[PDB]
Design a protein around this ligand. Structure first.
Ligand SMILES: CCCCCCCCCCCCCCCCCC(=O)OC[C@H](COP(=O)([O-])OCC(O)COP(=O)([O-])OC[C@@H](COC(=O)CCCCCCCCCCCCCCCCC)OC(=O)CCCCCCCCCCCCCCCCC)OC(=O)CCCCCCCCCCCCCCCCC
Ligand SMILES: Cc1cc2nc3c(=O)[nH]c(=O)nc-3n(C[C@H](O)[C@H](O)[C@H](O)COP(=O)(O)O)c2cc1C
Ligand code: SF4
Lengths: 56, 216
């Protein structure tokens, strides 16, 4: 956030809480809009042997 | 009828069935032609009593294994269609139908192929599978497709390209082929692979490990 400290004090007094601690606008703590690629694990039926479909 | 089966027919008649029987164990009567080839000092063919032990047959008529009997690695007792057996079994097994059935291989055509500790055991089985791939008539699905599939898998096994989880996979492929084909060529293609996997799995696994090591 970014505002005058006297306005922050007035806000805290009127609301009764420290507003700055839990700001409702996301300034910079959220995840990046670009991420590394994933890998994604395969399922339990991805076996090469002992996997006849009639048993599952 | 097989040529050998017919040729003996008149001698059995003249001498009698009782005489012919007087040779070999029960249900294993008569004499037999054996072709001893591979890693033996004197490869040949010889007539012998049915239930002769394998070791006596190899060391007497064929001159033994090159490098001594302790140089022996494996023996295919009845031609390529029968599963191979290791030296642990070869030293005490009899050369008849029931005895070799109890050794999980089978007498086959009584064509002993000997391989010593100096051969690539996977390469020999791969060559046999290539023979079966080239000899399939192609009529039925399990043979026509699965024998070619097994040939490709085995050629990759020879190099070590595969992973251990494929070995069991290969086993199941053979099981699907065996007993599901019109002809018994599918059985003869699936049995050598089963023998190699049953008796020489660690060699396959270490070949895969080596290939991974120098390839990463
Ligand atoms: C009489 C009271 C007027 C005081 C006032 O207008 O500003 C109070 C100003 C507001 O602070 P804040 O906006 O809460 O703090 C963060 C800033 O906005 C963050 O600052 P900023 O970067 O947004 O600044 C932009 C700048 C420029 O913005 C503008 O151009 C707005 C002008 C439009 C007004 C006409 O703001 C101004 O200079 C305009 C202020 C008043 C103009 C009217 O703080 C004070 O100086 C105290 C005022 C009295 C408190 C009660
Ligand atoms: C793929 C294949 C090839 C065979 N080739 C021969 C062969 O070359 N000679 C032979 O006597 N039997 C061969 N057989 C087995 C025959 O079925 C067998 O000769 C026939 O049943 C009669 O043989 P027998 O006199 O021993 O009873 C072959 C079987 C298969 C499945
Ligand atoms: S199993 Fe026999 S009939 Fe079937 S494709 Fe092979 S050779 Fe032909």
């Amino acid at each position: 956030a970014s505002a005058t400290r006297v306005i922050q004090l007035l806000r805290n007094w009127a609301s009764g809480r420290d507003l700055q601690a839990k700001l409702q606008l996301r300034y910079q703590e959220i995840s990046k809009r670009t991420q590394p690629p994933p890998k994604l694990p395969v399922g339990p039926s991805h076996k090469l042997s002992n996997n006849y479909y009639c048993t599952r | 009828a097989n040529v050998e089966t017919v040729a003996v027919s008149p001698t059995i008649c003249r001498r009698g069935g009782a005489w012919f029987a007087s040779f070999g164990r029960e249900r294993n009567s008569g004499t037999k032609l054996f072709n001893i080839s591979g890693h033996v000092n004197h490869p040949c063919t010889v007539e012998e009593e049915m239930s002769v032990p394998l070791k006596e047959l190899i060391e007497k008529h064929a001159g033994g294994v090159i490098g001594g009997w302790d140089n022996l690695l494996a023996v295919i007792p009845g031609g390529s269609s029968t599963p191979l057996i290791p030296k642990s079994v070869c030293e005490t097994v009899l050369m008849d139908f029931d005895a070799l059935v109890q050794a999980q291989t089978g007498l086959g055509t009584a064509a002993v192929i000997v391989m010593d500790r100096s051969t690539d055991i996977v390469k020999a089985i791969a060559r046999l599978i290539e023979f079966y791939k080239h000899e399939s008539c192609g009529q039925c699905t399990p043979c026509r497709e699965g024998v070619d599939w097994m040939n490709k898998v085995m050629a990759r096994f020879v190099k070590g390209d595969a992973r251990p989880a494929e070995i069991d996979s290969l086993w199941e492929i053979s099981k699907q082929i065996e007993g599901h084909t019109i002809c018994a060529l599918g059985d003869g293609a699936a049995w050598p692979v089963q023998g190699l996997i049953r008796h020489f799995r660690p060699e396959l696994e270490e070949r895969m490990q080596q290939f991974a090591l120098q390839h990463q």
